[PDB]
Design a protein around this ligand. Structure first.
Ligand SMILES: Nc1ncnc2c1ncn2[C@@H]1O[C@H](COP(=O)(O)OP(=O)(O)OP(=O)(O)O)[C@@H](O)[C@H]1O
Ligand SMILES: [Mn+2]
Length: 283
């Protein structure tokens, strides 16, 4: 809708197709004619704040949006810098960054496959316990790599995990610009992800914060929907443990691991990714 057309050029880069269009950015499949390789280009584009001009630059929808637009842009830059710290198969690899068209762009590695959200919607029968147990070692590795450098993800759900055709996962996006815009605009609904964010994110954060969201992802894969919103749980905890529900085809060991990651209070969860991984052993 707002996307650059196939054939658009950024010097050596050529746009091939808009493959993702959300409220806050566009993702393109593109081609580097100098290195003769396919890449992705992520374009900052907050549709509530900005529109596409005739010359294909980006312009404010209203002059009052300039401060929030710039703050989102700054957060987009900071996220690119964070991802540029890593060279890990499970984290989105950043090749280049530049500003143009009144906005900003990340050139990144192009990944095969699709999101975990799309895989769960389109092929849920592929997702069983054996598949989940193959997913977890590389997913654990990617998350732990963030933690070991002193950072947290804080936006994990099914929507921003890529599942490659190899089935290996990639963490694509931390939602930084979206969340900054939401906080400044009082659009609270775009900051935290209901059912994935644990209680301490609503206002003490650490690796256990991401571990809860990973538990919520796993819960969604096993029974089809995330657990109750954590603030609602903090009033009256209506979470039914998976070890009691006993969904068909799932071991108590995997179920219990998910339940422990979803402990309401941070101190009751696995405290590190390594601690959570240890729970899946002894079987
Ligand atoms: N580096 C990358 N390589 C390949 N694909 C990517 C990359 N980064 C993001 N994507 C894809 O971009 C899309 C971003 O999803 P978003 O919700 O913004 O767009 P969408 O138009 O709703 O896409 P979808 O087809 O997933 O519904 C996802 O389909 C994701 O797989
Ligand atoms: Mn979609």
């Amino acid at each position: 809708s707002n996307s650059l057309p196939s054939g658009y050029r950024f010097n050596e880069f050529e746009i091939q197709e808009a493959i993702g269009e959300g409220g806050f950015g566009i993702v393109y499949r593109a081609y580097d004619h100098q290195l003769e390789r396919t890449i992705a280009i992520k374009e900052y584009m907050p549709t509530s704040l900005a529109k596409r001009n005739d010359d294909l630059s980006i312009g404010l929808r209203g002059e009052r949006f300039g401060k929030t637009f710039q703050a989102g842009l700054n957060s987009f830059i900071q996220e690119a810098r964070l991802l540029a710290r890593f060279s890990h198969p499970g984290l989105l690899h950043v090749l280049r960054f530049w500003e143009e068209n009144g906005t900003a762009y990340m050139g990144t590695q192009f990944y095969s496959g699709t999101t975990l959200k799309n895989l769960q919607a389109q092929q849920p029968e592929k997702i069983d316990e054996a598949w989940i147990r193959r997913l977890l070692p590389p997913l654990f590795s990617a998350i732990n790599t963030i933690h070991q450098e002193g950072y947290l993800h804080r936006d994990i759900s099914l929507d921003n995990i890529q599942i490659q055709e190899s089935q290996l996962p990639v963490l694509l996006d931390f939602g930084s610009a979206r969340k900054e815009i939401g906080n400044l605009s009082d659009e609270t609904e775009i900051v935290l992800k209901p059912g994935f964010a644990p209680i301490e994110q609503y206002t003490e954060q650490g690796p256990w914060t991401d571990i809860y969201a990973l538990g919520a992802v796993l819960h969604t894969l096993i029974v089809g929907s995330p657990p109750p919103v954590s603030v609602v749980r903090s009033i009256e905890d209506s979470y039914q443990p998976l070890t009691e529900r006993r969904p068909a085809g799932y071991s108590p060991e995997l179920l219990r691991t998910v339940d422990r990651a979803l402990a309401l209070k941070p101190e009751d969860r696995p405290q590190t990714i390594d601690e959570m991984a240890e729970l899946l052993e002894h079987h």
